[PDB]
Nucleic acid binder design. Structure first.
Ligand SMILES: [Mg+2]
Ligand SMILES: [Mg+2]
Ligand SMILES: [Mg+2]
Ligand SMILES: [Mg+2]
Ligand SMILES: [Mg+2]
Ligand SMILES: [Mg+2]
Ligand SMILES: [Mg+2]
Ligand SMILES: [Mg+2]
Ligand SMILES: [Mg+2]
Ligand SMILES: [Mg+2]
Ligand SMILES: [Mg+2]
Ligand SMILES: [Mg+2]
Ligand SMILES: [Mg+2]
Ligand SMILES: [Mg+2]
Ligand SMILES: [Mg+2]
Ligand SMILES: [Zn+2]
Lengths: 55, 69
RNA sequence: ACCCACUCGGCACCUUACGAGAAAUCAAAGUCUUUGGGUUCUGGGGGGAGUAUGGUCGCAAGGCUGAAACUUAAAGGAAUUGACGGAAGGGCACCACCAGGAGUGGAGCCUGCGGCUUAAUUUGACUCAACACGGGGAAACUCACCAGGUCCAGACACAAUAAGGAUUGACAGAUUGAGAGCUCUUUCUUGAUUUUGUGGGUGGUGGUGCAUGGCCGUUCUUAGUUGGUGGAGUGAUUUGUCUGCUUAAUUGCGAUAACGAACGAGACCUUAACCUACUAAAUAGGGUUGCUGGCACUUGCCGGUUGACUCUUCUUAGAGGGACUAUCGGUUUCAAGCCGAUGGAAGUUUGAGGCAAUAACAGGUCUGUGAUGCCCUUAGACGUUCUGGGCCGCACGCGCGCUACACUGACGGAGCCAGCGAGUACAACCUUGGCCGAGAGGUCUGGGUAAUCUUGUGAAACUCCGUCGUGCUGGGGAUAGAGCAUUGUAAUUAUUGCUCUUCAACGAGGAAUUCCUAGUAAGCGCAAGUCAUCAGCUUGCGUUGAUUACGUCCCUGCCCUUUGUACACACC
């Protein structure tokens, strides 16, 4: 958003830039395309006998 | 810029030479009227002709007569 | 004569400084505001000045000694970051160079800008980053220039006439370039809209881009920029942001008072490349078959038809995937990566752009702008508007361009294949098909507001068979004359096209220097843009398609880095 404005002494050169947050952008992607966010892994228990569980 | 020319003669819009009670028409008796010159054939009465040396023209229709009177 | 350990004497370095120090640094320049070991000397802003004078000493030069008046706000010192350097290393880039290509500069011609000239030849921009740029190919308009005229578009406020008119209009010829009432000749119209002043504005391609905004360009599409802690410094600052190797890239590995971060780069985006895997079509294309044209004459070949039926390879264009340097090989501290084969549509950041940081520049724009400050002006207007010119004039300078200097040709025919595009209903657009015309171009008629019609835009260069053969020749078309067309109100200072005639310069261009590494260069044409009319212009497009690197810092430029700097309005 640019806008020329007076005053009496001369015209003032206003510009305005507002980097909107990706999460609340909605239109387009919800993230900056360089931003890669890796999720947390999940633990398991090895062995504990071969075992089974029937129905 | 370059300098302006200056011949000399200037021409202004004419002031017109206004006049009132001007000076056509007459009445001899009092009640009735005696029109001078004539009224317009094309438009209704009330508008009058312009009398020159065998040349007429009206005002409401800018300048549109030809025949004498 | 060494080794090794320690010692009196000498001459100098390293690290931390907890000690000094303004810091550079210094183990003395330490043991100093926690102020005192002893002693001699010198200095008290800068200059004036080591001058004047007087001694005194000298052969003299000169020394020693040593002033103020006057003058001035800084003179310094050290360091910090910049900028700069005819300093040194290390990079990068066909706006650098090689190895080459195409050239340009020569020739003629366009078309910019000088210069001259003119009534005016309007101006802006002058190394890259002014100079076929202002979307600027000006017949008027545009238009700012000049010669001439016209008009108020003089908002509102207050007053003087206030109808015994405030003022508006006005055919006829002289007037006047002129069916401009422009006016003076006129004597009819017009009804308080105004006109005369004074405040006040409005407009102004006036002025100043060194008063500004926005946009652009340029540093630079280069790789740079920043902070948060932590450290080093009193501090400006700095380190991070770096010895190397890589990368197109501050791109990463790696080493590391730095660690993890953002900006810029990349990612992203748009487009160009691949899909017999989907979803789709009588505005996209094919297959069978009907009717139907001709053939060979057997069943077979080409067709032409929106007659049917069906299909989606091409086509579009959705939605997906696909490439990740993938796999293998070496090569490289067996890192970052680079190099070669295999496959794969794609192995040059896959190709190309689009955006593009910090900080700026007195770059350019007040001639895109009711974007604009203030100086200009504001009715004899520098406003507006008409009318004719002018930007295009030419001894002559450079700057983009085009056509050629032919036989890889020229000229005839013949063959004959593209892509981007673009296009009218309130106008006049693209304009097939048919007739007229050697042409240009007319005309009727259509189709089309557009994958439908123009249009397969069957564009050119190309490919084939002939004419001339290396002679300023049929190469080359400039200059010219005349006509025939078309646009427009108007074409001479040829608007353009066409006709026939004229046949000039120029046998590959000196010094110089531009552009370029692949579907690129070079050739060729198309195309919209501006446009009523003009293409040598331009942004796009497709056709033909090489040569030569695939490196380096030799030049040029830039960038860091160390160094120096009496610079910081920063080498003008
Ligand atoms: Mg004048
Ligand atoms: Mg002194
Ligand atoms: Mg042009
Ligand atoms: Mg013209
Ligand atoms: Mg204007
Ligand atoms: Mg700090
Ligand atoms: Mg730094
Ligand atoms: Mg790219
Ligand atoms: Mg400026
Ligand atoms: Mg102005
Ligand atoms: Mg010109
Ligand atoms: Mg150019
Ligand atoms: Mg078409
Ligand atoms: Mg000849
Ligand atoms: Mg440069
Ligand atoms: Zn009449």
């Amino acid at each position: 958003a640019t806008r020329h404005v007076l005053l009496r002494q001369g015209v003032l050169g206003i510009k305005v830039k507002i980097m909107k947050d990706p999460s609340r952008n909605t239109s387009g992607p919800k993230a900056l395309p360089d931003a890669v966010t890796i999720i947390e892994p999940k633990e398991e228990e090895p062995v504990l006998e071969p075992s089974v569980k029937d129905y | 810029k370059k300098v302006y020319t200056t011949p000399k003669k200037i021409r202004h819009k004419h002031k017109k030479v206004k006049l009132a009670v001007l000076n056509y028409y007459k009445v001899d008796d009092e009640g009735k009227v005696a029109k001078l010159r004539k009224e317009c054939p094309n438009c209704g009465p009330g508008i009058f002709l312009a009398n020159h040396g065998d040349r007429f023209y009206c005002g409401k229709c800018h300048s549109t007569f030809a025949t004498q009177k």
